[PDB]
Amino acid sequence: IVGGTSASAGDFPFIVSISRNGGPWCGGSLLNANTVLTAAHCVSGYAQSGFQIRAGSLSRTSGGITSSLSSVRVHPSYSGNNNDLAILKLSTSIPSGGNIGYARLAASGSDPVAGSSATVAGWGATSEGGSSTPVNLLKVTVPIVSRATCRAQYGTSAITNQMFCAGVSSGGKDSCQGDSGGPIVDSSNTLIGAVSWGNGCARPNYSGVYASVGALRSFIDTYA
């Protein structure tokens, strides 16, 4: 996260860190006791055993409850950046309670409205290309950017109905490398997306692009 502040305990009861090979990698959202939602690109085709999920902590490396993966399923229409969601099943069930809880999802067919305020969180880099990453979870609030403006930035084909965008014209507030798969929420803390892609991090006039939960509810609901 670029331009962020430290998340408080219980800000995102459902957020998980996704370590790979023991190191930082992605974020995700706990949907129920054995299921995590993340970005497809975080997991597609990689060795599943390399991943470890942790819930209930502001750190990636201690606290809360861990699990390995039992299975990975990417969206059936995943291609390039499009439809960038995956359902992970957990080898160890994780109970709600305390600072762990399960996400509530954006309604099927909803689309975040330009100008509304979204909050994204993760353990990723604090500058584009940064090597070091924070121990504790960061968050940042950015407005939704219309799909039309986002298509002006990236091209028409590049931004689909299964993506939405968020950021500020001046840049300086965004998700970055290592934040992929983690949550973006609306002002009510309803999960509206997963961190997906963008042109660098926090650049002027290049929004962050997010996989849209409201657009992708059939997949999520079927396999969660």
From Swiss-Prot:
Residues 1-224 form the Peptidase S1 domain. InterPro entries: Peptidase_S1 (IPR050430), Peptidase_S1_PA (IPR009003), Peptidase_S1_PA_chymotrypsin (IPR043504), Peptidase_S1A (IPR001314), Trypsin_dom (IPR001254), TRYPSIN_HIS (IPR018114), TRYPSIN_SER (IPR033116). GO terms for cellular component: extracellular region. It is an enzyme of class 3 (hydrolase). GO terms for biological process: proteolysis. The active site is at 41 (charge relay system), 84 (charge relay system), 180 (charge relay system). The keyword Disulfide bond applies. GO terms for molecular function: serine-type endopeptidase activity. Disulfide bonds join 26-42, 150-165, 176-201. Keywords: Disulfide bond, Hydrolase, Protease, Secreted, Serine protease, Signal, Zymogen. The keyword Nucleotide-binding does not apply. PROSITE patterns: TRYPSIN_DOM, TRYPSIN_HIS, TRYPSIN_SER. Belongs to the peptidase S1 family. This is Trypsin. The lineage of its organism: Eukaryota, Fungi, Dikarya, Ascomycota, Pezizomycotina.
